[PDB]
DNA sequence: ACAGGATGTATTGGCCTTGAACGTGCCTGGAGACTAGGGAGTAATCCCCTTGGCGGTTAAAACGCGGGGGACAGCGCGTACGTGCGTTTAAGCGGTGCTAGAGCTGTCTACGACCAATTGAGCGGCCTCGGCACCGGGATTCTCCA
DNA sequence: TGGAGAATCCCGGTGCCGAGGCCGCTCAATTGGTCGTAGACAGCTCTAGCACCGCTTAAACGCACGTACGCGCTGTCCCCCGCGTTTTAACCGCCAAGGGGATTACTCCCTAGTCTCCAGGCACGTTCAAGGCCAATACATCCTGT
């Protein structure tokens, strides 16, 4: 299990593309925005900014989760690790 | 210049039989100054974003919505609207 | 003949002082007539909320005077005020009693 | 629409974060965290949009909201 | 003789109920002045300034210790170690 | 020198208010270092404020401004 | 003749003066402040651009893309401390794999 | 209104043979705008604390020393003072 | 499981000091009534840009299988931290005396805000050509077995 | 195993599309002149920060002992990982049609600025009810032999 995972870590830390498909993200953003105002229109650059911010946030959170998991003497990440990282971050 | 007189009036309105000390009054003054600064800064930024040169009650309302959490914001908006309506009608 | 702007709006906080503070903090070049009436009402509401909670906290300790400990307890026991003042330190306030479950005797 | 954030996508995001092994309950937790983040940002952006009496959400609105939450973003205006 | 752990819980209860300062005042004042000497010479301090510094320092340390205690129970331990402080400060961004 | 006036019982007292039940013997040096760094930052900012005002005395307002600059607001000192 | 030529700068001193006078920072603005601000901004831009150009030259490239800016910023302690809470679009991350995982 | 021309001249001074893409120039514009806002806000705050009505070079110097870290601040101060002395001598 | 036993801990009741709350003058800062100029609330128009639908391709998502590595529990050992006592050390509290420096006041000057002409620096389009990404095609190099 | 077999790196071709340069025009930066007020400096007053001395006692330091816990080792089993079909839907290019974002002109009404009047808030100077404190004492709690 080490080989392909390490190769993927090397590959995805060298690139800079987006890692979430763009059609689903638009639908999620639009569905969330329905609970604040009805019949809303989005620019094609607002959604790109939202996706960039979301992906950066998630990658940083996973970086912190990995540290918590290693602190627990593990190589696998678990929901407890995300919860501890978010509690210490003040979220 | 402080907010001691008005804090005391509000206190005797909510709790007629309760007093306050001096350090608690200092904390209350710090609280009032802090929140005033927050709302004023947000209103200034909102006025600058839309290329306007006046701070109206609209900017105060939007700043209150941006800064306060949840139900606090709704009740603050209700109180502010009631005050402005009563002021204009008089 | 003179009537204060706070009596006109039914407020206890000074509208005339807030108007002066808004024109001397360099926030804009003109200030509307209703902005200091809205800001003062919001400030008064927040003060009244905190004071109600702190007075209850003081009455629960058989006391008739609020001290910083009561303010801290009131702020940290309320979910919304805690979020509003989550990066604020209160002098002589202390902390909330809390012991982790795993550390209690078995 | 939250299920459009797929398991392969969350694995890629974890790989960019230098993660070797992932448990099976991570995906739902990640979906919830993403939802909370998006809700906060979008609420602030639509608040900026209702002010100025507009019906279209712009990029500068999301930039202002992200700056207001301490997540300044470069490259979009 | 009380068993190991009882007095610790008693002290936790005692110190989570009080609001007094926990560091002595003269040693803290000396440390503040010694640190300040490396920025400017012949500095004078108001009493309120050192009081504020002490309040802020003690609050910061107490919060850091709470986070450190959370990091130790995550590793199935009841004893705090320097690794826990190091992890908490790393996650906090310090 | 003066960093050793922050004694082991004092750090134990501070850890008890944070709810700690057991403390290792290497904690005290780490705590002293952390406190030194924090004080260095705050005092640097406050002394800069004092120097700008053409003063030879540090006031409480300088400390308050410094702490609020570092994102740690303090109530009760003005 | 231009206020930038008299200071030996490539950044606009007049535009900075206009932006200071219309951003509600003070009632009056002194004559030396635009020069100081322009000099500081020019210095910071030069630093970032030098590091980014070196990063682009490490690879066989002659153009600066956001990836090079990110690599320049994260590999310098001072700029990383200054720009610590800032996200750069299409910048990626620094490649670091923690030990114990190998 | 952007900072593209000046960033380009600085680039040609530092690296006379390297170009720059159009999605990096936006990053640079955002950088300049953010640093300008930071310094100007801190200078305004310094002037307000001391009951002054003017923002001078001293305020800018103090803001630069308060915001920038370590050895960046020293070089920034040197550049600013050199520029102001050259401007006054002219 | 339980019952003494020494210990910490929650009750009163009585003094009893300081600080909280009140009352007075008086001095600014808030309010009232005009006047004059421009900020912004409304219409009206142009044209960008957002949304919606459709066909085709193919890269990515989903599903199932089989096996090994990693998480988690149980056990043993030995280091080191909690507990309680006896011995040193210096923090804390007053009192006195001494300036250094912060706060306020008065006067005089030079620096920054306006205002009206004038001209060239900086967007805006329109081309034009090489960096770079892509595309095969060998050459070179990491992982696993007799 | 130091022999295979993919993975990766290194080579040219190429072509295309985006950065970089050139020209016409308008609007914001420069210049010259004046004025009124903000900041600078000197002289003065007096509060508060610093320093020394002596006593008393509350923390700090040190020491020894025994126990709970940190850490390593081992075993089991099950759950993530990797891989080969199918199946879904994202992506791209194209066309079509208003919603509404972005300017512009006209007009009114709202906010700044001034002078006058006057009452709300601040600084002092007494006082008498909270709350911290001290014995004195009956309960709630921990630990252990049986």
Residue numbers in the entry:
A (entry chain E): 43 to 133
B (entry chain H), H (entry chain D): 35 to 124
C (entry chain G): 13 to 118
D (entry chain F): 25 to 101
E (entry chain A): 40 to 133
F (entry chain B): 23 to 100
G (entry chain C): 15 to 116
What's the paper's own text on this?
Nr5a2 is a key pioneer factor that regulates zygotic genome activation in totipotent embryos, pluripotency in embryonic stem cells and metabolism in adult tissues, but the mechanism of its pioneer activity remains poorly understood. The DBD consists of two modules of Cys4-type zinc fingers, a carboxy-terminal extension (CTE) and a fushitarazu-factor 1 (Ftz-F1) domain. Unlike many other nuclear receptors, Nr5a2 binds as a monomer to its DNA motif, TCAAGG(C/T)CA, on naked DNA and nucleosomes. The nucleosome structure is stabilized by minor groove anchors, which are electrostatic interactions between arginine residues of histones and the DNA minor groove.
To test this, we selected the strong binding site with the motif positioned at SHL +5.5 for subsequent experiments. To exclude the possibility that insertion of the Nr5a2 motif into 601 DNA affects DNA end flexibility, we determined the structure of the NR5A2-unbound nucleosomeSHL+5.5 by cryo-EM and found that it corresponds to the canonical nucleosome structure. In the canonical nucleosome, the minor groove at SHL +5.5 is occupied by the minor groove anchor histone H2A Arg77. The register of DNA in the nucleosomeSHL+5.5 was determined from a high-resolution cryo-EM map region near the dyad axis. To compare the backbone geometries of all histones, the NR5A2–nucleosome complexSHL+5.5 was superimposed on the nucleosomeSHL+5.5. The root mean square deviation (r.m.s.d.) values of the corresponding Cα atoms showed no change on the NR5A2-unbound side; however, the backbone geometries of histones on the NR5A2-bound side were shifted. This suggests that histones are slightly rearranged owing to NR5A2 binding, which could be due to loss of the minor groove anchor and release of DNA from histones.
